[PDB]
């Protein structure tokens, strides 16, 4: 499952 | 088997191509290997394509409609060498998309446009060959039209290339840092599935068929057999000369298909069975083919040199700053008049043939 933290800053 | 990347995230190891290196996907050295391939390619692609564009513009004699189309091809290759390869290189040594999603988009769009434009341009070339063979009547044709035609191909190319930018599909390639259309998921909001079938068939496949079809018609007419001198199965030197052009065009197409076809096939197969493995669905396979497609950019300058004496001799004229074109010259129309070049051999107002001016030249 992808980590949600990078969701905010995908870049 | 799959995560957003081609590798499974059995371990938590998988990380976004945007965020981190993808070292888990393949060996680090493999990264440098792809980077190395790209660096060498940049040199060859740039030099060869520039030479083609430079030579024809430089040499007045090489002004054929076909030459116009070839510049277009050369230009498409140049963008690859300048624009796409550079980014693909940076990534490779970085091991991922440092640039981030926006750039993935920029990087996919330009490269996609380049591929579409090439196949489409090849079709125009095929049609023009067909036209030349059946109806030698020179007047039904215009240089101005050719430019218009070239622009048109770009327009259509944009029709596929641009819509992904419009809310449509998107994404990076297996190990990748090369970006392409979203074959992996059916990102619903995105409407990926529709776009995928549409693009491959309409842009790549249909044009391939037409080129193939036009090729068949040419089969009845001028064929491979061509005697070097005008005499023998050739009705006029010009007729005998043309057969040479057609053969090169054929080879250009063949090389194109070999380079691209594997990518397009893989394009579709994962569409049908995503999240699974083809023979093996992996980083390696997708990667190999897409990078291979890149190699195409280099091949055309080589084919020209081998394939046609006219370019070969004229190019050499360019390479040595002065004429110095020993080796037997074009021994035909290096230029119609004599040698051809910007200056040097290509004399102003090259000669005209017929009482009237047959070719639109010497105008």
From Swiss-Prot, chain A:
Entry PTM: The substance P form is cleaved at Pro-2 by the prolyl endopeptidase FAP (seprase) activity (in vitro). Substance P is also cleaved and degraded by Angiotensin-converting enzyme (ACE) and neprilysin (MME).
Modified residues (Methionine amide): 11
Lineage: Eukaryota, Metazoa, Chordata, Craniata, Vertebrata
Site residues by UniProt (Cleavage): 2-3, 6-10
Protein name as it appears in the record: Substance P
UniProtKB/Swiss-Prot annotation, chain B:
Pfam families named among the record's database cross-references: 7tm_1
GO-annotated biological processes: aggressive behavior; angiotensin-mediated drinking behavior; associative learning; behavioral response to pain; detection of abiotic stimulus; eating behavior; inflammatory response; long-term memory
Positions with a binding annotation for CP-96345: 196
One annotated Gene Ontology cellular component of this protein: sperm head
Extracellular side: 1-30, 86-105, 169-193, 270-282
Cytoplasmic side: 54-63, 128-147, 219-247
Ranges that cross the membrane: 31-53, 64-85, 106-127, 148-168, 194-218, 248-269, 283-307
Glycosylation site residues: 13, 17
Topological relation to the membrane, as annotated: Multi-pass membrane protein
Lipid-binding residues (covalent, S-palmitoyl cysteine): 321
Chief location bin: membrane
Keyword annotations: Cell membrane, Disulfide bond, G-protein coupled receptor, Glycoprotein, Lipoprotein, Membrane, Palmitate, Receptor, Transducer, Transmembrane, Transmembrane helix
Cysteine pairings via disulfide bonds: 104-179
GO molecular function: substance P receptor activity; tachykinin receptor activity
Subcellular location: Cell membrane
PANTHER family linked: G-PROTEIN COUPLED RECEPTOR TKR-1-RELATED (PTHR46925), SUBSTANCE-P RECEPTOR (PTHR46925:SF4)
Family under the similarity heading: Belongs to the G-protein coupled receptor 1 family.
Function as written in the Swiss-Prot or TrEMBL entry: This is a receptor for the tachykinin neuropeptide substance P. It is probably associated with G proteins that activate a phosphatidylinositol-calcium second messenger system. The rank order of affinity of this receptor to tachykinins is: substance P > substance K > neuromedin-K.
Binding partners and assembly: Interacts with ARRB1.
Name of the featured protein: Substance-P receptor
Species whose genome carries this gene: Homo sapiens
């Amino acid at each position: 499952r992808p980590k949600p933290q990078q969701f905010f800053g995908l870049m | 088997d799959n995560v957003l990347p081609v590798d499974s995230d059995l371990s938590p190891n998988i990380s976004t191509n945007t965020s981190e290196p993808n070292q888990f996907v393949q060996p680090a050295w493999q990264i440098v290997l792809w980077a190395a391939a790209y660096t060498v390619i940049v040199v060859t692609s740039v030099v060869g394509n520039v030479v083609v564009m430079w030579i024809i513009l430089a040499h007045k004699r090489m002004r054929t409609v076909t030459n116009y189309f070839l510049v277009n091809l050369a230009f498409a290759e140049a963008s690859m060498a300048a624009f796409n390869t550079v980014v693909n290189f940076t990534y490779a040594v970085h091991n991922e998309w440092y640039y981030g999603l926006f750039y993935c988009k920029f990087h996919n769009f330009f490269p996609i446009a380049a591929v579409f434009a090439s196949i489409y341009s090849m079709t125009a070339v095929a049609f023009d060959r067909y036209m030349a063979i059946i109806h030698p009547l020179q007047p039904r044709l215009s240089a101005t039209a050719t430019k218009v035609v070239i622009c048109v191909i770009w327009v259509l190319a944009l029709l596929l290339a641009f819509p992904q930018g419009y809310y449509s599909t998107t994404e990076t390639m297996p190990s990748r840092v090369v970006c392409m259309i979203e074959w992996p998921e059916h990102p619903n909001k995105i409407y990926e599935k529709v776009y995928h079938i549409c693009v491959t068939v309409l842009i790549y496949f249909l044009p391939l068929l037409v080129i193939g079809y036009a090729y068949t018609v040419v089969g009845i007419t001028l064929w491979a057999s061509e005697i070097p001198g005008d005499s023998s199965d050739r009705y006029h030197e010009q007729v005998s000369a043309k057969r040479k052009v057609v053969k090169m065009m054929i080879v250009v197409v063949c090389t194109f298909a070999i380079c691209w076809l594997p990518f397009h096939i893989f394009f579709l197969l994962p569409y049908i069975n995503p999240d699974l493995y083809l023979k093996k669905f992996i980083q390696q396979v997708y990667l190999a083919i897409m990078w291979l497609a890149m190699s195409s950019t280099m091949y055309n300058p080589i084919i020209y040199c081998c394939l046609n004496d006219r370019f070969r001799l004229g190019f050499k004229h360019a390479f040595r700053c002065c004429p110095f074109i020993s080796a037997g010259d074009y021994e035909g129309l290096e230029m119609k008049s004599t040698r051809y070049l910007q200056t040097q051999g290509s004399v102003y107002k090259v000669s005209r043939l017929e009482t009237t001016i047959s070719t639109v030249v010497g105008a």
